């Protein structure tokens, strides 16, 4: 029994290294629509899930009370925070205000 003929992934693996570094993916290389390559629903689902996970962790750690959690939960659903860092910075602003009021 002879061995199977070789089908090699060496070129693909080398090209994968270049693409991981940011090559071969510019404007001239794109054939599908932007939503086809990266659906906006998938991006929204990831972002909202990140924001909801962070708020739950902050509530469980008692960094925020349930009233602040509920206010931020509705605002996360309302497209107020662009990413995780935007939400954390806003929580710091709320916490700083509460300290001054205290």
């Amino acid at each position: 029994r002879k061995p199977v003929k070789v089908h090699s992934r060496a070129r693909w693996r080398k090209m994968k290294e270049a693409k991981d570094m940011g090559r071969h993916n510019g404007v001239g290389r794109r054939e599908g629509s932007r939503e086809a390559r990266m659906p906006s629903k998938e991006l929204w689902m990831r972002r909202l899930r990140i924001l909801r996970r962070l708020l739950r962790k902050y509530r469980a750690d008692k960094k925020i009370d349930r009233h602040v959690y509920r206010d931020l939960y509705m605002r996360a659903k309302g497209n107020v925070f662009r990413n995780k860092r935007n939400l954390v910075e806003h929580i710091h602003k709320i916490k700083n205000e509460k300290k001054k009021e205290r």
Partner: protein, 122 residues
Amino acid sequence: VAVRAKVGSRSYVRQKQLAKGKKVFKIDCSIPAADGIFSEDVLGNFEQFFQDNTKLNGRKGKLSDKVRLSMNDNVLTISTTMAYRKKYFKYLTKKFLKKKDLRDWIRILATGKGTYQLKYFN
């Protein structure tokens, strides 16, 4: 993955390090040594071949003390604290035999964990 790779870093690729070191590989060349092809001068550049060709952290030749190569008891012993594949010294062996036109004569085979022995095609 977590950190984006740079092209300049290909000059120095990090090689893995064992926690509890002293991993030993053995090349058993007893069968062909009795036939004289592995002569005194052949054994000279044989271990020399394994000296400057064995790569470390990507670089080649600078073995330092991380990899120790020794010759005694008619068998070749490679000891290193670094993390190496056993196939690598089978691939280095095949490179040597091709350089000396012996690949059609001597086949390297696995006998146990960490041991490679050199026999003849029957």
